[PDB]
Design a binder for this molecule. Structure first.
Ligand SMILES: [Br-]
Length: 208
C-alpha cells in the first residue's frame, strides 16, 4: 500500500544517531557468521575509535549481549526468536518479520526463513534472496506493520508487532482486534519485501 510513512520513520530511526547505518551493515555481516561479535572486532572492521563504536551501541538500547559483553543480537541474532533465518545450514534468528526480508540484500546471502502465523499458529516459510522472494508458503502470506516511535524501545514498540500471517484476510481479522497499535497496517509479504528494498536503498545512501 502507501508505505511512505513507514519508510520515512524507519530511516529517521537509523539517521537519529550518527554512524548507526555505517555500523549496521558490517555488524550484520559479522553476525551472519553465527558467532558473537566483540566491540573491538567491530572497531577494527569499521576503522573507528572504540569510543565511537561504544557510543553508537549505547543508543541502540535493544542490542543483545552475551556473558562476555560480545554482541549477539542486533536485528539479526543468535538468540532464539519466532523468526528463523537460516543461511548455509546455520540457523540464526531475526527480531521481526520485516528484518528477515531486509537482511539478505545487506549481507549478500539467500536465507530460508520460517515462522508461524501470529493469528492462527500455521507454519509459514519463504526463501529470501537479495533480489526476490520465492517458495512463499502460503502464497498469500502477510506481514503486519506499525509506525516506529522516537526514543521508544525498538523491540517493544516496533519489532514485537511486526509478524507474519497466513493471509491478508487472516491478518486483517487479527488487526481489527489490535487497533490501539499506532499505524497498524496489514500488507502482503511481497509489499513488505518492497518496503525492505526501499529501506535498504535509502540506507546504502546514508552510508559514508
Ligand atoms: Br502515503
Amino acid at each position: 500500500m502507501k508505505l511512505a510513512p513507514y519508510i520515512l520513520e524507519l530511516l529517521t530511526s537509523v539517521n537519529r544517531t550518527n554512524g548507526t547505518a555505517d555500523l549496521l551493515v558490517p555488524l550484520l555481516r559479522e553476525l551472519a557468521k553465527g558467532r558473537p561479535v566483540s566491540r573491538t572486532t567491530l572497531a577494527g572492521i569499521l576503522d573507528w575509535p572504540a569510543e565511537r563504536v561504544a557510543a553508537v551501541l549505547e543508543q541502540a538500547t535493544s542490542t543483545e549481549y552475551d556473558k562476555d559483553g560480545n554482541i549477539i543480537g542486533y536485528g539479526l541474532t543468535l538468540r532464539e526468536t519466532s523468526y528463523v533465518f537460516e543461511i548455509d545450514d546455520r540457523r540464526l534468528y531475526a527480531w521481526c518479520a520485516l528484518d528477515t526480508l531486509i537482511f539478505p540484500a545487506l549481507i549478500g546471502r539467500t536465507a530460508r526463513v520460517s515462522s508461524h502465523c501470529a493469528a492462527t499458529g500455521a507454519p509459514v516459510s519463504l526463501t529470501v534472496s537479495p533480489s526476490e522472494i520465492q517458495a512463499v508458503e502460503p502464497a498469500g502470506m502477510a506481514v503486519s506493520l506499525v509506525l516506529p516511535q522516537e526514543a521508544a524501545d525498538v523491540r517493544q514498540s516496533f519489532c514485537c508487532h511486526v509478524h507474519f500471517f497466513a493471509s491478508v484476510p487472516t491478518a486483517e481479522d487479527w488487526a481489527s482486534k489490535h487497533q490501539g497499535l499506532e499505524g497498524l497496517a496489514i500488507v502482503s509479504v511481497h509489499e513488505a519485501f518492497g518496503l525492505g528494498q526501499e529501506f535498504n536503498r535509502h540506507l546504502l545512501q546514508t552510508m559514508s
